[PDB]
Amino acid sequence: FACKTANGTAIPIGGGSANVYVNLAPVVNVGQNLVVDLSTQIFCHNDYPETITDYVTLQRGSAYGGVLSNFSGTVKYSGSSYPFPTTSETPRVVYNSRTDKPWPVALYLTPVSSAGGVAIKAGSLIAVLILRQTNNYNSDDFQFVWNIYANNDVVVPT
Ligand SMILES: OC[C@H]1O[C@H](C/C=C\c2ccc(-c3ccccc3)cc2)[C@@H](O)[C@@H](O)[C@@H]1O
Ligand code: NI
């Protein structure tokens, strides 16, 4: 089991960490959502699907910087929604193919009223998403850690 991002770093077999940059709507109001869909960026595959089934969970979702102080959130994982920051590890998604398949994670972030001005800084860390992979074959239990960085400023009026 291994993961990569669209253009492009990878995390090899056995886990590790990578940094991911995301484009954000540059203006969001109180009551509107920022959607950060990571499923178009993080792709995973099973290296031996004929004998092994890989199980993948969102172990933990944590907020940082601007998002942590100026936004409230949920995360959508494989159809289901959860508070973001997360309060527990999710159910699992099966990976049973050598073909790259998206990691189906999306954040929905909404400004709290105390946000005004630049509520997320360009280049700043906004979130960490930990992917936990196990299988039905041996005791492999690995974390793939995605550090999420803002590409651009996000302003909340006025
Ligand atoms: O993505 C599937 C598996 O890929 C790798 C497997 C690591 C060692 C391994 C490799 C091949 C075989 C194997 C089994 C049957 C036939 C041929 C090879 C068994 C273990 C590891 O990432 C496992 O964690 C993961 O479950
Ligand atoms: Ni591979």
Numbering used by the authors: 1 to 158
Study authors write:
The adherence of UPEC to the urothelial surface is mediated through the mannose-specific lectin FimH, the natural ligand of which is the mannosylated glycoprotein uroplakin Ia present on urothelial cells. Mannose-based FimH antagonists compete with this interaction and prevent bacterial adhesion and hence infection. Here, the first crystal structures of C-glycosidically linked α-d-mannopyranosides in complex with the FimH adhesin of uropathogenic E. coli J96 are reported. Two ligands are decorated with a para-biphenyl group on a C-linkage to an ethene spacer (CcbP) or to an ethene with a branched methyl spacer (CtbP) and one with a naphthyl group on a C-linkage to an ethyl spacer (CN).
